């Protein structure tokens, strides 16, 4: 039905929101510290000096294990 | 159709995976450091001296800004 199509759309959008903002291909699993933006995979996060969202300096990257992984 | 029911179940399971494993009521937004388990809301994470997933000592809690929030 049309309702099946609407639910398919919500699932797709939620899954897309879990992908790296830089490469769009790998799941987010890294946090820029201390700001806390968790928007990248480990490969894309490794080389950024400043947060791509808020421009704060990245002191380090913390790996995160999310239940959605 | 039955497919609408199946998609409703996938969306429910994905949304449940975003809720605190301790209180089951608030969104996950906190990471236990240094282990990296990100399974609690800020209120439950502030009360645990040990990680509920791996039992490593919590040195500190890092707030995470996720795109799914
Ligand atoms: C593979 N590994 C090693 C240590 N921890 C993990 C792990 N994987 O997924 C998870 C999530 C946290 C809630 C379940 N943890
Ligand atoms: Zn990436
Ligand atoms: Zn930031
Ligand atoms: Zn909680
Ligand atoms: Zn842990």
CSV table of N, CA and C and ligand atoms in Angstrom, one decimal:
chain,number,residue,atom,x,y,z
A,1,UNK,N,0.8,-1.2,0.0
A,1,UNK,CA,0.0,0.0,0.0
A,1,UNK,C,0.9,1.3,0.0
A,2,UNK,N,0.3,2.5,0.0
A,2,UNK,CA,1.0,3.7,0.1
A,2,UNK,C,1.7,3.8,1.4
A,3,UNK,N,1.1,3.2,2.5
A,3,UNK,CA,1.7,3.2,3.8
A,3,UNK,C,3.0,2.4,3.9
A,4,UNK,N,3.1,1.3,3.1
A,4,UNK,CA,4.4,0.6,3.0
A,4,UNK,C,5.5,1.5,2.4
A,5,UNK,N,5.1,2.3,1.4
A,5,UNK,CA,6.0,3.2,0.7
A,5,UNK,C,6.5,4.3,1.7
A,6,UNK,N,5.6,4.8,2.5
A,6,UNK,CA,5.9,5.9,3.5
A,6,UNK,C,6.9,5.3,4.6
A,7,UNK,N,6.7,4.1,5.1
A,7,UNK,CA,7.5,3.4,6.1
A,7,UNK,C,8.9,3.1,5.4
A,8,UNK,N,8.9,2.7,4.2
A,8,UNK,CA,10.2,2.4,3.5
A,8,UNK,C,11.1,3.7,3.4
A,9,UNK,N,10.4,4.9,3.2
A,9,UNK,CA,11.0,6.2,3.1
A,9,UNK,C,11.6,6.6,4.5
A,10,UNK,N,10.9,6.4,5.6
A,10,UNK,CA,11.4,6.7,6.9
A,10,UNK,C,12.6,5.9,7.3
A,11,UNK,N,12.6,4.6,7.0
A,11,UNK,CA,13.7,3.6,7.2
A,11,UNK,C,14.9,4.1,6.5
A,12,UNK,N,14.7,4.4,5.2
A,12,UNK,CA,15.8,4.9,4.3
A,12,UNK,C,16.5,6.1,4.9
A,13,UNK,N,15.7,7.1,5.3
A,13,UNK,CA,16.2,8.4,5.8
A,13,UNK,C,16.9,8.3,7.1
A,14,UNK,N,16.5,7.3,8.0
A,14,UNK,CA,17.1,7.1,9.3
A,14,UNK,C,18.5,6.4,9.1
A,15,UNK,N,18.5,5.4,8.1
A,15,UNK,CA,19.7,4.7,7.8
A,15,UNK,C,20.8,5.7,7.2
A,16,UNK,N,20.3,6.6,6.3
A,16,UNK,CA,21.2,7.6,5.7
A,16,UNK,C,21.8,8.5,6.7
A,17,UNK,N,21.0,8.9,7.8
A,17,UNK,CA,21.5,9.8,8.8
A,17,UNK,C,22.7,9.1,9.7
A,18,UNK,N,22.9,7.8,9.6
A,18,UNK,CA,23.9,7.0,10.3
A,18,UNK,C,25.2,6.9,9.4
A,19,UNK,N,25.3,7.5,8.2
A,19,UNK,CA,26.4,7.4,7.4
A,19,UNK,C,27.3,8.7,7.5
A,20,UNK,N,28.6,8.5,7.4
A,20,UNK,CA,29.6,9.5,7.4
A,20,UNK,C,29.3,10.7,6.6
A,21,UNK,N,29.4,12.0,7.1
A,21,UNK,CA,29.0,13.2,6.4
A,21,UNK,C,30.1,13.5,5.3
A,22,UNK,N,31.3,13.0,5.4
A,22,UNK,CA,32.3,13.2,4.4
A,22,UNK,C,32.3,12.2,3.2
A,23,UNK,N,32.4,10.9,3.5
A,23,UNK,CA,32.4,9.9,2.4
A,23,UNK,C,31.0,9.4,2.0
A,24,UNK,N,30.0,9.5,2.9
A,24,UNK,CA,28.7,9.0,2.6
A,24,UNK,C,28.6,7.5,2.4
A,25,UNK,N,29.7,6.8,2.8
A,25,UNK,CA,29.7,5.3,2.5
A,25,UNK,C,29.9,4.4,3.7
A,26,UNK,N,30.5,4.9,4.7
A,26,UNK,CA,30.8,4.1,5.9
A,26,UNK,C,30.0,4.7,7.1
A,27,UNK,N,29.7,3.8,8.0
A,27,UNK,CA,28.9,4.2,9.2
A,27,UNK,C,29.7,5.1,10.1
A,28,UNK,N,29.0,6.1,10.7
A,28,UNK,CA,29.6,6.9,11.7
A,28,UNK,C,30.0,6.0,12.9
A,29,UNK,N,31.2,6.2,13.4
A,29,UNK,CA,31.7,5.4,14.6
A,29,UNK,C,32.8,6.2,15.3
A,30,UNK,N,32.9,7.5,15.0
A,30,UNK,CA,34.0,8.3,15.6
A,30,UNK,C,33.4,9.7,16.2
A,31,UNK,N,34.1,10.2,17.3
A,31,UNK,CA,33.6,11.4,17.9
A,31,UNK,C,34.8,12.4,18.0
A,32,UNK,N,34.6,13.6,17.5
A,32,UNK,CA,35.6,14.6,17.7
A,32,UNK,C,35.5,15.1,19.1
A,33,UNK,N,36.7,15.1,19.8
A,33,UNK,CA,36.8,15.6,21.2
A,33,UNK,C,37.6,16.9,21.3
A,34,UNK,N,37.2,17.9,22.1
A,34,UNK,CA,36.1,17.8,23.1
A,34,UNK,C,34.7,18.2,22.7
A,35,UNK,N,34.5,18.8,21.4
A,35,UNK,CA,33.2,19.3,21.0
A,35,UNK,C,32.0,18.2,21.1
A,36,UNK,N,32.3,17.0,20.7
A,36,UNK,CA,31.4,15.9,20.7
A,36,UNK,C,30.6,15.6,19.4
A,37,UNK,N,30.9,16.3,18.3
A,37,UNK,CA,30.2,16.0,17.0
A,37,UNK,C,30.7,14.6,16.6
A,38,UNK,N,29.7,13.7,16.3
A,38,UNK,CA,29.9,12.3,16.0
A,38,UNK,C,29.2,12.2,14.6
A,39,UNK,N,30.0,12.6,13.6
A,39,UNK,CA,29.4,12.7,12.2
A,39,UNK,C,30.3,11.9,11.1
A,40,UNK,N,31.4,11.3,11.5
A,40,UNK,CA,32.4,10.7,10.6
A,40,UNK,C,32.7,9.2,10.8
A,41,UNK,N,33.2,8.5,9.8
A,41,UNK,CA,33.7,7.2,10.0
A,41,UNK,C,35.2,7.4,10.5
A,42,UNK,N,35.9,6.4,10.9
A,42,UNK,CA,37.2,6.5,11.5
A,42,UNK,C,38.3,7.1,10.4
A,43,UNK,N,38.2,6.7,9.2
A,43,UNK,CA,39.1,7.1,8.1
A,43,UNK,C,39.0,8.6,7.8
A,44,UNK,N,37.8,9.1,7.7
A,44,UNK,CA,37.5,10.6,7.4
A,44,UNK,C,37.9,11.4,8.6
A,45,UNK,N,37.6,11.0,9.9
A,45,UNK,CA,37.9,11.7,11.1
A,45,UNK,C,39.3,11.8,11.4
A,46,UNK,N,40.1,10.8,11.0
A,46,UNK,CA,41.6,10.8,11.3
A,46,UNK,C,42.4,12.0,10.8
A,47,UNK,N,42.0,12.6,9.8
A,47,UNK,CA,42.8,13.7,9.2
A,47,UNK,C,42.3,15.1,9.4
A,48,UNK,N,41.1,15.3,10.1
A,48,UNK,CA,40.6,16.6,10.3
A,48,UNK,C,41.2,17.3,11.5
A,49,UNK,N,41.6,18.6,11.3
A,49,UNK,CA,42.2,19.3,12.4
A,49,UNK,C,41.1,20.0,13.2
A,50,UNK,N,40.0,20.4,12.6
A,50,UNK,CA,39.0,21.1,13.2
A,50,UNK,C,37.7,20.4,12.9
A,51,UNK,N,36.7,20.5,13.7
A,51,UNK,CA,35.4,19.9,13.5
A,51,UNK,C,34.7,20.4,12.3
A,52,UNK,N,34.3,19.5,11.4
A,52,UNK,CA,33.6,20.0,10.1
A,52,UNK,C,32.2,20.6,10.4
A,53,UNK,N,31.7,20.4,11.6
A,53,UNK,CA,30.3,21.0,12.0
A,53,UNK,C,30.5,22.3,12.7
A,54,UNK,N,31.4,22.4,13.7
A,54,UNK,CA,31.5,23.6,14.6
A,54,UNK,C,32.8,24.4,14.6
A,55,UNK,N,33.8,23.8,13.8
A,55,UNK,CA,35.1,24.4,13.7
A,55,UNK,C,36.0,24.4,14.9
A,56,UNK,N,35.5,23.7,16.0
A,56,UNK,CA,36.4,23.6,17.2
A,56,UNK,C,37.6,22.7,16.9
A,57,UNK,N,38.7,23.0,17.5
A,57,UNK,CA,39.9,22.2,17.3
A,57,UNK,C,39.7,20.7,17.8
A,58,UNK,N,40.2,19.7,17.0
A,58,UNK,CA,40.0,18.4,17.4
A,58,UNK,C,41.2,18.0,18.3
A,59,UNK,N,41.0,17.8,19.6
A,59,UNK,CA,42.1,17.4,20.4
A,59,UNK,C,42.4,15.9,20.2
A,60,UNK,N,41.4,15.1,20.0
A,60,UNK,CA,41.5,13.7,19.7
A,60,UNK,C,40.2,13.1,19.2
A,61,UNK,N,40.3,11.9,18.7
A,61,UNK,CA,39.1,11.2,18.2
A,61,UNK,C,38.8,10.0,19.1
A,62,UNK,N,37.6,9.9,19.5
A,62,UNK,CA,37.2,8.8,20.4
A,62,UNK,C,36.4,7.8,19.6
A,63,UNK,N,36.7,6.5,19.5
A,63,UNK,CA,36.0,5.5,18.8
A,63,UNK,C,34.7,5.3,19.6
A,64,UNK,N,33.6,5.1,18.9
A,64,UNK,CA,32.3,4.8,19.6
A,64,UNK,C,31.7,3.5,19.0
A,65,UNK,N,31.2,2.7,19.9
A,65,UNK,CA,30.4,1.5,19.7
A,65,UNK,C,28.9,1.8,19.9
A,66,UNK,N,28.1,1.9,18.8
A,66,UNK,CA,26.7,2.3,18.9
A,66,UNK,C,25.9,1.0,18.8
A,67,UNK,N,24.7,0.9,19.5
A,67,UNK,CA,23.9,-0.3,19.4
A,67,UNK,C,23.4,-0.4,17.9
A,68,UNK,N,23.2,0.7,17.2
A,68,UNK,CA,22.8,0.6,15.8
A,68,UNK,C,23.8,0.1,14.8
A,69,UNK,N,25.1,-0.1,15.2
A,69,UNK,CA,26.1,-0.6,14.3
A,69,UNK,C,25.8,-2.0,13.7
B,1,UNK,N,-0.7,-4.3,4.1
B,1,UNK,CA,-0.3,-5.6,3.7
B,1,UNK,C,0.6,-6.2,4.9
B,2,UNK,N,1.0,-7.5,4.8
B,2,UNK,CA,2.0,-8.0,5.7
B,2,UNK,C,3.3,-7.2,5.7
B,3,UNK,N,3.7,-6.7,4.5
B,3,UNK,CA,4.9,-5.9,4.4
B,3,UNK,C,4.9,-4.6,5.2
B,4,UNK,N,3.7,-4.0,5.3
B,4,UNK,CA,3.5,-2.8,6.1
B,4,UNK,C,3.9,-3.2,7.6
B,5,UNK,N,3.4,-4.3,8.1
B,5,UNK,CA,3.6,-4.8,9.4
B,5,UNK,C,5.1,-5.1,9.7
B,6,UNK,N,5.8,-5.7,8.7
B,6,UNK,CA,7.2,-6.0,8.7
B,6,UNK,C,8.1,-4.7,8.8
B,7,UNK,N,7.7,-3.7,8.0
B,7,UNK,CA,8.4,-2.4,8.0
B,7,UNK,C,8.2,-1.7,9.3
B,8,UNK,N,7.0,-1.8,9.9
B,8,UNK,CA,6.6,-1.2,11.2
B,8,UNK,C,7.5,-1.8,12.3
B,9,UNK,N,7.8,-3.1,12.2
B,9,UNK,CA,8.7,-3.8,13.1
B,9,UNK,C,10.1,-3.4,13.0
B,10,UNK,N,10.6,-3.2,11.8
B,10,UNK,CA,12.0,-2.8,11.5
B,10,UNK,C,12.2,-1.3,12.1
B,11,UNK,N,11.2,-0.5,11.8
B,11,UNK,CA,11.3,0.9,12.3
B,11,UNK,C,11.3,1.0,13.8
B,12,UNK,N,10.5,0.1,14.5
B,12,UNK,CA,10.4,0.0,15.9
B,12,UNK,C,11.7,-0.5,16.5
B,13,UNK,N,12.3,-1.5,15.9
B,13,UNK,CA,13.6,-2.1,16.4
B,13,UNK,C,14.7,-1.1,16.3
B,14,UNK,N,14.8,-0.3,15.2
B,14,UNK,CA,15.8,0.7,14.9
B,14,UNK,C,15.6,1.9,15.9
B,15,UNK,N,14.4,2.3,16.2
B,15,UNK,CA,14.1,3.4,17.2
B,15,UNK,C,14.5,2.9,18.6
B,16,UNK,N,14.2,1.7,18.9
B,16,UNK,CA,14.5,1.1,20.2
B,16,UNK,C,16.0,1.0,20.5
B,17,UNK,N,16.8,0.7,19.4
B,17,UNK,CA,18.3,0.7,19.5
B,17,UNK,C,18.9,2.1,19.8
B,18,UNK,N,18.1,3.2,19.6
B,18,UNK,CA,18.5,4.5,19.8
B,18,UNK,C,18.2,5.0,21.3
B,19,UNK,N,17.5,4.2,22.1
B,19,UNK,CA,17.1,4.5,23.5
B,19,UNK,C,18.1,3.9,24.5
B,20,UNK,N,18.3,4.6,25.6
B,20,UNK,CA,19.1,4.2,26.7
B,20,UNK,C,18.9,2.7,27.1
B,21,UNK,N,20.0,1.9,27.2
B,21,UNK,CA,19.9,0.5,27.6
B,21,UNK,C,19.5,0.4,29.1
B,22,UNK,N,19.6,1.4,29.9
B,22,UNK,CA,19.3,1.4,31.3
B,22,UNK,C,17.9,1.8,31.7
B,23,UNK,N,17.5,3.0,31.3
B,23,UNK,CA,16.2,3.5,31.5
B,23,UNK,C,15.2,3.2,30.4
B,24,UNK,N,15.6,2.9,29.2
B,24,UNK,CA,14.7,2.6,28.1
B,24,UNK,C,13.7,3.8,27.7
B,25,UNK,N,14.0,5.0,28.2
B,25,UNK,CA,13.1,6.1,28.0
B,25,UNK,C,13.7,7.3,27.3
B,26,UNK,N,15.0,7.5,27.4
B,26,UNK,CA,15.6,8.7,26.8
B,26,UNK,C,16.6,8.3,25.7
B,27,UNK,N,16.8,9.2,24.8
B,27,UNK,CA,17.8,8.9,23.7
B,27,UNK,C,19.2,8.7,24.1
B,28,UNK,N,19.9,7.8,23.5
B,28,UNK,CA,21.4,7.7,23.8
B,28,UNK,C,22.1,9.0,23.3
B,29,UNK,N,22.9,9.6,24.1
B,29,UNK,CA,23.7,10.8,23.8
B,29,UNK,C,24.9,10.9,24.6
B,30,UNK,N,25.4,9.7,25.2
B,30,UNK,CA,26.6,9.8,26.0
B,30,UNK,C,27.5,8.6,25.8
B,31,UNK,N,28.9,8.8,25.9
B,31,UNK,CA,29.8,7.8,25.7
B,31,UNK,C,30.7,7.6,26.9
B,32,UNK,N,30.9,6.4,27.3
B,32,UNK,CA,31.8,6.1,28.4
B,32,UNK,C,33.2,6.1,27.8
B,33,UNK,N,34.1,6.8,28.5
B,33,UNK,CA,35.5,6.9,28.0
B,33,UNK,C,36.4,6.3,29.1
B,34,UNK,N,37.4,5.6,28.7
B,34,UNK,CA,37.9,5.4,27.3
B,34,UNK,C,37.4,4.2,26.5
B,35,UNK,N,36.5,3.3,27.0
B,35,UNK,CA,36.1,2.1,26.3
B,35,UNK,C,35.3,2.5,25.0
B,36,UNK,N,34.5,3.5,25.0
B,36,UNK,CA,33.7,3.9,23.9
B,36,UNK,C,32.3,3.4,23.7
B,37,UNK,N,31.8,2.6,24.7
B,37,UNK,CA,30.4,2.2,24.6
B,37,UNK,C,29.5,3.4,24.8
B,38,UNK,N,28.5,3.5,23.8
B,38,UNK,CA,27.6,4.7,23.7
B,38,UNK,C,26.3,4.1,23.7
B,39,UNK,N,25.8,3.7,25.0
B,39,UNK,CA,24.5,3.0,25.2
B,39,UNK,C,23.6,3.7,26.2
B,40,UNK,N,23.9,4.8,26.7
B,40,UNK,CA,23.1,5.5,27.8
B,40,UNK,C,22.7,6.9,27.5
B,41,UNK,N,21.6,7.4,28.2
B,41,UNK,CA,21.3,8.8,28.2
B,41,UNK,C,22.3,9.5,29.2
B,42,UNK,N,22.3,10.8,29.2
B,42,UNK,CA,23.2,11.5,30.2
B,42,UNK,C,22.9,11.2,31.7
B,43,UNK,N,21.6,11.0,32.1
B,43,UNK,CA,21.3,10.8,33.5
B,43,UNK,C,21.7,9.4,33.9
B,44,UNK,N,21.5,8.4,33.2
B,44,UNK,CA,22.0,7.0,33.5
B,44,UNK,C,23.5,6.9,33.5
B,45,UNK,N,24.2,7.6,32.5
B,45,UNK,CA,25.7,7.6,32.3
B,45,UNK,C,26.4,8.2,33.5
B,46,UNK,N,25.8,9.4,34.0
B,46,UNK,CA,26.3,10.1,35.2
B,46,UNK,C,26.4,9.2,36.5
B,47,UNK,N,25.5,8.2,36.5
B,47,UNK,CA,25.4,7.3,37.7
B,47,UNK,C,26.2,6.0,37.7
B,48,UNK,N,26.9,5.7,36.6
B,48,UNK,CA,27.6,4.5,36.5
B,48,UNK,C,29.1,4.7,36.6
B,49,UNK,N,29.7,4.0,37.6
B,49,UNK,CA,31.1,4.0,37.8
B,49,UNK,C,31.9,3.1,36.8
B,50,UNK,N,31.2,2.1,36.3
B,50,UNK,CA,31.6,1.0,35.4
B,50,UNK,C,30.8,1.0,34.2
B,51,UNK,N,31.4,0.6,33.0
B,51,UNK,CA,30.6,0.5,31.8
B,51,UNK,C,29.6,-0.7,31.9
B,52,UNK,N,28.3,-0.5,31.6
B,52,UNK,CA,27.4,-1.7,31.7
B,52,UNK,C,27.6,-2.7,30.6
B,53,UNK,N,28.4,-2.4,29.6
B,53,UNK,CA,28.6,-3.4,28.5
B,53,UNK,C,29.9,-4.2,28.8
B,54,UNK,N,31.0,-3.5,29.1
B,54,UNK,CA,32.3,-4.2,29.2
B,54,UNK,C,32.9,-4.2,30.6
B,55,UNK,N,32.3,-3.4,31.6
B,55,UNK,CA,32.8,-3.3,33.0
B,55,UNK,C,34.1,-2.6,33.2
B,56,UNK,N,34.6,-1.9,32.1
B,56,UNK,CA,35.8,-1.1,32.3
B,56,UNK,C,35.4,0.1,33.1
B,57,UNK,N,36.3,0.7,33.9
B,57,UNK,CA,36.0,1.9,34.7
B,57,UNK,C,35.7,3.1,33.8
B,58,UNK,N,34.7,3.9,34.2
B,58,UNK,CA,34.4,5.1,33.4
B,58,UNK,C,35.3,6.2,33.9
B,59,UNK,N,36.3,6.7,33.2
B,59,UNK,CA,37.2,7.8,33.5
B,59,UNK,C,36.4,9.1,33.4
B,60,UNK,N,35.6,9.2,32.3
B,60,UNK,CA,34.6,10.3,32.1
B,60,UNK,C,33.6,10.0,31.1
B,61,UNK,N,32.5,10.8,31.0
B,61,UNK,CA,31.5,10.7,30.0
B,61,UNK,C,31.6,11.8,29.0
B,62,UNK,N,31.5,11.5,27.7
B,62,UNK,CA,31.6,12.5,26.6
B,62,UNK,C,30.3,12.6,26.0
B,63,UNK,N,29.7,13.8,26.0
B,63,UNK,CA,28.4,14.0,25.3
B,63,UNK,C,28.6,13.9,23.8
B,64,UNK,N,27.7,13.2,23.1
B,64,UNK,CA,27.8,13.0,21.7
B,64,UNK,C,26.6,13.7,20.9
B,65,UNK,N,26.9,14.6,19.9
B,65,UNK,CA,25.9,15.2,19.1
B,65,UNK,C,25.8,14.3,17.8
B,66,UNK,N,24.7,13.6,17.7
B,66,UNK,CA,24.5,12.7,16.6
B,66,UNK,C,23.6,13.3,15.6
B,67,UNK,N,23.7,12.9,14.3
B,67,UNK,CA,22.7,13.5,13.4
B,67,UNK,C,21.3,12.9,13.6
B,68,UNK,N,21.2,11.6,14.1
B,68,UNK,CA,19.9,11.0,14.4
B,68,UNK,C,19.1,11.6,15.5
B,69,UNK,N,19.7,12.5,16.3
B,69,UNK,CA,19.1,13.1,17.5
B,69,UNK,C,17.8,13.9,17.1
C,1,LIG,C1,32.8,-5.5,18.8
C,1,LIG,N1,32.9,-4.9,20.1
C,1,LIG,C2,34.1,-5.0,20.9
C,1,LIG,C3,33.8,-4.3,22.0
C,1,LIG,N2,32.5,-3.8,22.0
C,1,LIG,C4,32.0,-4.2,20.8
C,1,LIG,C5,30.7,-3.8,20.4
C,1,LIG,N3,30.1,-4.0,19.2
C,1,LIG,O1,28.8,-3.5,19.3
C,1,LIG,C6,28.7,-3.0,20.6
C,1,LIG,C7,27.5,-2.3,21.0
C,1,LIG,C8,27.5,-1.5,22.3
C,1,LIG,C9,26.0,-1.9,22.5
C,1,LIG,C10,26.4,-3.2,21.7
C,1,LIG,N4,29.8,-3.2,21.2
C,2,LIG,ZN1,33.9,8.6,5.9
C,3,LIG,ZN1,32.1,20.0,16.7
C,4,LIG,ZN1,18.8,6.4,30.7
C,5,LIG,ZN1,32.5,-0.3,27.7
